[PDB]
């Protein structure tokens, strides 16, 4: 009898960038969701396809925990049927998405006085991503007709841009840590059940 490691997901030290989000697989454990029922003032606890109250009574084949960091005004983009920079070029959710999304402010943790340049996002891309797709390419984007030849210049841009988090920023431009819990059901013994 093993409890699920939700603490190691919510209480981590370093969170991945949005364009290289981190995925963890949770299986063969008893899911105690009280750690989510207590919480603290939290920016978002929105669930899709299932009620938060019934979680302690459903068995899932496996659970996916996806962790990353964005800014405040983009938190609304982590939801099915959304469009924008993050939705189209960084992280996309399916239309028939079952799972929960939790998001909370992290200004005291991910902000630096001179600017934090460790968190980056993709700005230029020629097409959207299929759901649950990751792109870690770092090649020069050709905006014009003349090929770039791997060097920046006119009509040739490095794709990734830096957030530059500062403590003097507005609430919408402050860092937010986002965890997406995705639930799956297939022909499996459903080793993630809960206390029932």
């Amino acid at each position, epitope marked *: 009898t093993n409890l699920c490691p939700f603490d190691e997901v919510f209480n981590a030290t370093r969170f991945a960038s949005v364009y290289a989000w981190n995925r963890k697989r949770i299986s063969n454990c008893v899911a105690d969701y*009280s750690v989510l*029922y207590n919480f603290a003032p939290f920016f978002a*606890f*929105k*669930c*899709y*396809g*299932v*009620s*938060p*109250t*019934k979680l*302690n009574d459903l068995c899932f084949t496996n659970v996916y925990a996806d962790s990353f960091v964005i800014r405040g005004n983009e938190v609304s983009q982590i939801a*099915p*049927g959304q469009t924008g920079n993050i939705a189209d070029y960084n992280y996309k959710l399916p*239309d*028939d998405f*079952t799972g929960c999304v939790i998001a909370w402010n992290s200004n005291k943790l991910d902000s630096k006085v001179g600017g934090n340049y460790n968190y980056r996002y993709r700005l230029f891309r020629k097409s959207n991503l299929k759901p649950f797709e990751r792109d870690i390419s770092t090649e020069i984007y050709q905006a014009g007709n003349k090929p770039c030849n791997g060097v920046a210049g006119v009509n040739c841009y490095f794709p990734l841009q830096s957030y530059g988090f500062r403590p003097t920023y507005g609430v919408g431009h402050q860092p937010y840590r986002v965890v997406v819990l995705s639930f799956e059901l297939l022909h499996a013994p459903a080793t993630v059940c809960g206390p029932k």
Partner: antibody
Amino acid sequence: VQLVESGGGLVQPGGSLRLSCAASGFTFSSYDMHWVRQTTGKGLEWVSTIGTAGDTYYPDSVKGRFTISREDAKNSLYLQMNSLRAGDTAVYYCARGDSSGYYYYFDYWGQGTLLTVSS
Amino acid sequence: IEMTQSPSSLSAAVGDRVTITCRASQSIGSYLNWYQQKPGKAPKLLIYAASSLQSGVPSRFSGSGSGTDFTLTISSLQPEDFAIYYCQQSYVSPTYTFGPGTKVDIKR
């Protein structure tokens, strides 16, 4: 299954008021409870939810003002409201929640109490 | 999620067939419930899962649709079937949203 509400009445802006909903005909501790309010100019709007494991949820326009509690021994449910503005005038219903598979519905509603706030 | 209903008001006689439509701003699958309200009374749950019939409910009520469009159908209207009908989405939680409402009248 019967649900009877009480506590509505007149109250000044910025005050506080408690409403109660007493249930009979079912096991009280095996079901989730909600408070939904109705106004003529806006329709039905969900305002509060409490579950079996002592978990509470609130919408954006109501957080920080309302508190939902339940007492299984006395078989009752309570909603406490503080710092009211004039926009909370409505008819309040206590409702029982239920679910089939993943689909969630309110199966039983009460008569509802009429709450008027104004100076 | 913005939720719309059509038409705003409908008039029908006893024995007629009445159809009312509910539309969402997103794809909610089959996460739609239909509720009935008579004047000065509590709402009654008519249909859940957009197709299932609640026990103790007349068989003349039918629900259909999926995705962005759903339909409520009354086959043989009766005097105890004149009320306001709402559609509610159960896809996004815990914030549940109800429709504006369609009121059924008597033809004159």
